[PDB]
Design a protein around this nucleic acid. Sequence first.
DNA 1: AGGGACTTTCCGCTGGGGACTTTCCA
DNA 2: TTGGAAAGTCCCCAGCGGAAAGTCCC
Lengths: 273, 273, 312, 312
Amino acid sequence: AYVEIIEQPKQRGMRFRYKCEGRSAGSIPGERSTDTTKTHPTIKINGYTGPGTVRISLVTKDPPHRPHPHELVGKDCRDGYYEADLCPDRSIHSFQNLGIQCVKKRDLEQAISQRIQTNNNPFHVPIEEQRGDYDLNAVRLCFQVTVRDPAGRPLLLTPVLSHPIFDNRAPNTAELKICRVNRNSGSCLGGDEIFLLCDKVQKEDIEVYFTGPGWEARGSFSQADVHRQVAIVFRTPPYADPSLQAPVRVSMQLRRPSDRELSEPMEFQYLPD
Amino acid sequence: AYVEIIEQPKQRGMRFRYKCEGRSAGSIPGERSTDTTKTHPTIKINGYTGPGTVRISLVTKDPPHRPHPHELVGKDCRDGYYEADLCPDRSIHSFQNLGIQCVKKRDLEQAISQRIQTNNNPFHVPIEEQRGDYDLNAVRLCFQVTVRDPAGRPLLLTPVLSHPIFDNRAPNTAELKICRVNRNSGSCLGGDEIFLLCDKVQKEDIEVYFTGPGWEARGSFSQADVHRQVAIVFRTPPYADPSLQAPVRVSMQLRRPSDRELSEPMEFQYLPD
Amino acid sequence: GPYLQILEQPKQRGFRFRYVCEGPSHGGLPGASSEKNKKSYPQVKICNYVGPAKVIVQLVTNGKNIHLHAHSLVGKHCEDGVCTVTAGPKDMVVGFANLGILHVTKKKVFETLEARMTEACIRGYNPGLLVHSDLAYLQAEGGGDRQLTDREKEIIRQAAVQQTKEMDLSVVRLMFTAFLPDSTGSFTRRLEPVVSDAIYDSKAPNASNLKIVRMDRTAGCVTGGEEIYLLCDKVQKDDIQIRFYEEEENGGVWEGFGDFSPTDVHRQFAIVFKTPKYKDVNITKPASVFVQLRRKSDLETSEPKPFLYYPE
Amino acid sequence: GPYLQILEQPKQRGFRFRYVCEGPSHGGLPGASSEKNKKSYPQVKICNYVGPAKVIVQLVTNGKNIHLHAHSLVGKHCEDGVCTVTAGPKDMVVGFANLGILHVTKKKVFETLEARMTEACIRGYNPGLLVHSDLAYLQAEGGGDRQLTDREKEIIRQAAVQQTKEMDLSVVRLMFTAFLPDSTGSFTRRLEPVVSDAIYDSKAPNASNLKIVRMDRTAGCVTGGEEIYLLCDKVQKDDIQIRFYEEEENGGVWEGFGDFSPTDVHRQFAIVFKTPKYKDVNITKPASVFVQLRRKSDLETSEPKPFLYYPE
DNA sequence: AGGGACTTTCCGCTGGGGACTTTCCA
DNA sequence: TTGGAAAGTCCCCAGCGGAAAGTCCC
């Protein structure tokens, strides 16, 4: 009798709200929920259908999953965690009212104290091993399901995790997007100056990736040409064929080195001199 | 078409910074500059305005201008040298981001090998005539401009040197400054005791120079009254007129015999007994 | 008679106010003409007097009715929000380098203002002009009432609450007060205080140095309509215009604007617009004009930046 | 019971630690009693036992919890930073002349400290007291575990990194330990080791001799406020003071300090200051006092030097 | 042996500047 | 609620010195 996530939460998109904000945040989306149809976090208990209880807890992103300072708020929640009974006659349970409320780097310690005083530590990470910096732009849901063994006495299953959730406030992980481009056609010898407006990017972890069939180049630009994270001015790289006779469509796009992530491609036409 | 230095780089004042120091060294100020003015260590191209490139290199001080172990770091540099594109529609170019990054007497051989492997020898000093000790407290900027003959094909002009730059490190050359003086007034008959704190001087090559109108004397003091190279305790020579009736202002300053160098004057007022 | 006068006015814009939490020494204030090398030394000067003197500097508001500002003047010679330097017995020209404004937080605006009125009534630093009308009886008498009564604490509590419901934390003024030595030698002789131009926080969205960082094209046909990409410093979509123009023969100016809508204003930092038609679409030779940005709200502009209109 | 006892402590200040690259033999310890005529050296004695014996000398930290020190004891009978001599079968007093202090570089502190704890746990030289609490099981048993296990290499790596974050490179102490022959004859019987007074490297600014070289005025009015220029030996602008003082009748002392700021301390070698007011501004006859230099940090002083306070 | 001085790291403040957070308003 | 900011936090880079540490040498 174990637990498995049927429907993981959406990773990026939703922004955690502070306590001083909306008495209410939002509600965590499934991961296949769309504008048309909305879904939600859903686990599946294998080898058990009957009376029990479930607790959803907030933990840290990486390995030593210490309980996160952030508070899960909404229906049936309290002390930063969610808890309610399991449908005794169903094996699948989705939670449609999960809300993340983030704490301030200031009230950090006070928050950690409440995870302790309230006994919230699903991986029993030690008081000694609890020390360290906490990533406040991400978390994981930790489902601690409690069924009953065949005898009839409560049975706490293994705590399972969900891939990490990310605050739509962390540009180190948001989605790349190109918004404008004052020029999508230059010389095949390259060197053409190009003004590109975009979405918040990080000047040290970004580059214009010109891809082609079997070809691959980058635009030339210095970290200081990344204008306030929303505009890059760079010069086109020379195409594979320097004597081009006929114009050739090429794929141009934003690339964040740290993770190989790529924005949608934007058509660019290399031309004979 | 030749090259000439409109503005020469200041020779003293600026200290070469070690690789360990920061990430970048300040930038070589110009000779002209001071408290009140802007200074550019520029060059002038005579008989040519148009497409061209410029490489600023580091060459030794004295005659066999073998390339310098030290490096030229800052904007547009690499391999210890500056290089970029001349402005095509201008004939005057100043360089305001040149810094000097010395090497350790220990990593001397490895720096010399990088001048060789990167082909950095403007006066092609021979592999054989390359042997010998390098003056690490002095170097020479070596502009190597490359324009094009009336013809069209690149034309490398002659390498032009600037007077040497000295590391404000070895005190045998530093700049002379008087900081404090426990007295700037005394008898015409001289013989007055004066303490004077100043910038590092050598006791065997220093002396207090009292200049006046067509008059000239020196302060009396032992090499031993030179305290830790920072203070001088000396006595005031007697003024030209030992019967002075009214007070007379006179110039007093530090003087290095080995090169006549003089610090900025301090008003001294002889008086009658 | 003996008086006080401003030789050099602070620059009004281009300076950032600094919060406590940001730390110390981020830049001093400035004066006119800020030539390439940094040359401003703002210098007041005492006139028709030459001898010992005390000059104090306080932060006041930019309303119709002068008042103490909750903000603090910090740095060289400053203490308790006031800069106190002495005017040499011979040299009567005072300068004020390394002077920074300390931006108080919104939340601590009342209590900080209340404590500043207290300190100014204790030291007798212009209490009647800046805190309240009927407190002018408290003059710096080598310590004009070193101890405030319980009725004087009630005048300050009422002036504080009343002045905080309307205090522009984004603009402030300097006010110099000179004090000459009385009989005893104590500088209690007050001269008519003189206030300075206004100085606008550069961290105000409506006051950052409006600047045109780069432009993909600096020339254009006289028929205009051409599209230009331009980056810039923080600007407000709805509160900004690109203004083309040129000095005329008669002294007047040809004015033309860029065509673009608030949606064309990319993330506060750039603007894609369309050149305006030049005054004369049929010249035979190119003409140079100027192009700048410009807040509607306060009509402040960026620096005239050259643009060339050519024929077609 | 059989113990160890120091006869002559090393001299606390004045000796210079030398770095590898300085060359060899540059000067012997020095004994606390040592003079330029009668030179002495550290010296210890084995009491309540007479016969062969082994005594070793290790440097240790000067903290609250004694720890091995990265520096190495070099020279006479020294190897691997350890001084080892034998206590003659009848003369139980051992001296240590020509002992030098090798000062490890900053960059080689960790790796050289790791190497020393290992050599100390292999030979069994007080591993428990100096390297780590639960390593005391490695006792010099004719070769107390001549081969360190893998778990022992880890304790070492964890003590090394933990102890290097707070090691004072300008202070060291000697630790003597004595071993007496066992049943087999192998010097394995360990006596309570004993530690010496701390030694301070004479190159360290916070430990170099303080001395007033010259002064442009050794007398002053009792009113004080008079400005004097003082030349000295390397001193730290932030950690130094000028103390004037005179023995009182009751045995106490009148204390007076020069008024000077860290900016008055010129290129670590002079100081422009102003005299303090005397304890009595109305005496009728001059009084001879004393003035000296004093580091705050450790409170050491320059040699009392004569100053004359005449009345006005 | 004995101490001065030169050459190679390490640190700290001043001046600004961009960008990450918490709070605020439509 | 959702989005977009403005208001309040952080804290890097770059240019200067000044000295400590680490090297050599009279």
